Every structure is written in C-alpha cells, then in structure tokens.
Design a protein around this ligand. Sequence first.
Ligand SMILES: [Cl-]
Ligand code: NI
Lengths: 33, 336
Amino acid sequence: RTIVRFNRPFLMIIVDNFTWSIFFMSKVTNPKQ
Amino acid sequence: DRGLASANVDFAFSLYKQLVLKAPDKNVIFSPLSISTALAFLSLGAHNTTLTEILKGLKFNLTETSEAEIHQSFQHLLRTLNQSSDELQLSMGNAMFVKEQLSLLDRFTEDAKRLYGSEAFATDFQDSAAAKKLINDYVKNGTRGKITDLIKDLDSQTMMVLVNYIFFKAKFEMPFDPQDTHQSRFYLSKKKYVMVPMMSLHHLTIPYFRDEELSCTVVQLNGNASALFILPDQDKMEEVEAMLSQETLSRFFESLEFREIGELYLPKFSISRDYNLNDILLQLGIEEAFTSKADLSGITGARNLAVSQVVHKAVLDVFEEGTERSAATALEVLFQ
Ligand SMILES: [Cl-]
Ligand code: NI
C-alpha cells in the first residue's frame, strides 16, 4: 500500500560493492530532453 | 583499501556537483570511473608535480594508498567490468592512439597493457578526419553503437589520445509490461510539467528506505554493483544534492529494507550529455598537466607532451526490460 512515483526530478547511481567506485551517475530533470 | 572508497566517492560527488554548477537544471549523465581511469592511465607516465596533482585530483591520498596500490585497484576493477550473463552485459576498454613515429618507453607500454588493458594504435593524426574516425569507431564498437562522435574536433598536431569506454546493460529483476506504459505528467517543477511515457508495475518487493529527514525515498531496482534510484519530494532535489556524501550514501545502504510496493511508476526515456572537462579538472587542481611545465616523461623519456583537451560523453536508456548505460573519455595530448 505504498506508492513510489518517479514523476519529478530524481537521481540514479551505480555503485561497486567492494570499491565504492561509482560507475555511472545521473540526474533526470526532464526525461523528454 | 577502505581509503580507496573514500577517494572514489569524493571524486564522483565532487565531479557531479561541478557538472551541475555549470547548468543547474539540465539532465546529467556521466561515468566517474571512466574519467578517473583515463586520468589514472595517464598518471602512469607522469612525474613530480604533474603526477601528484593528478592523483590528488582523483581524491587519492598518496600517504594512505601508494601509486602502485592505486594502479592495482584499477587493474582489478577493470577485469570485473568485462562480463556477460543472461542478466548483464558489461564491457570496459582502454586504448592509446599514438603518432606512428613517436617513441614510447617500454615500461610505459608494458604498464599500460598489464594494468589498464591498453594496446597502442599507430595513428596518422595529420590525416585528422581518418584519425577521428579511427577513435570514434573504437568507442562505437566498444559501446555497441551507443557513444558516437565522442571526438568532434581533433588538432592535427595531436601526439596521442588515451581513450576509455564503459558499457553496462542490465535486465530488470521484474520487467515492466509495455501494456502498462502510459503517458503521464512529469513535473519539471511544481507548476511546469510535460507528458512522458510512464512505465508501471504493481506489487513489487524491492529494497526500500524512506528518509523523512532528507525528504527523499530511495529504492533499488536491481551482480556485484548496486543501482540506487533516489526520489526527492518535489522541490527537494536541491536539498538532496546538498547532502550527497560518502556518509549519506553509506546511510542509504545501511537503511534499505525489503518492502512491498503497491505501485511503482518510472519513465521510459533516453538522455545523453557531452562535456569538455578542462575547466573542472583545473578547478580540481590538475593544472601542470595542461601547461608547458607538464611532466609526462614517463611516456616517452622526455618532457615533450602536455594535455590539451579532455572530453567525456555518456548515454542512459531506461525501458521496460531494463537499463543501458555507456560512456567514454578521451584525453588529447599535444607535443611540446
Ligand atoms: Cl546512472
Ligand atoms: Ni533517500
């Protein structure tokens, strides 16, 4: 009964478990660019 | 070591905030690992202040992790980023494109191959369009068509180009059904909004954490690399960005518990960005590499090379079956 709605700016991060090297990172302010 | 983690996160978040500051409302996509691997690869041939400025720019503490342990961590990491599954496609490559007659130290070519997986390609930079096509095809091949035109302008007096690419394709644990994708509002801000294809799933059990303190929710939608989706409340993106750090990233990880989600909505979309990183890298203290005081004599045996341009390009695809990420970094080097 919980709603998670990505209808506003959001962040994504791809993190290596062992090194915490960050492979990729993004901020989405407008998916329609 | 654990001091590598503290460096990697500081570098990634430092770079991110600098990318945002240039245009604070634009989409951002980039690969911190791609950029730091290309610079670490360069530092194999650096000495003295040129070398220390690079490794410090990457947020490494030389007293804490030696140069050999940094290269060792990169080597180990590169080998893990070439994998294939029914759920994962990973690939990462390094290469140096070199003026055909330019003599390279044996130690440098050996180190470059052993630690960074890099071959050396004789290239005719004076034939600028052909050299550019050579490098852009190598990146296009490496990223399976996703990063094109990484190099747009190439000085015809170029001596070498160090290139990194990375490709990451991953299927969702629970895919979205395309029948359930429908046009929905996306709010740029509280009163500016557009319509985008919005994917949806019902009754998902996924790692979850509501952080009422920072006014955000984080979830995980997927190997040995985690993918975090961080969803600030409206008008709380800036606040959330202000709190990004190793500390709060660790807190996000230590607070994710599995939880059943009634409905999950996520846009179907593609964004890309390209940057020139000279300003940012100078701002990070990597400065001697760009001047006639550059010391890259570990490459050739003389101080006859300096960096001219660092470019970066990245692309992100989000669709019903999963996500696709790719990026590349080129470090262009002139004679001196
Ligand atoms: Cl990302
Ligand atoms: Ni959060």
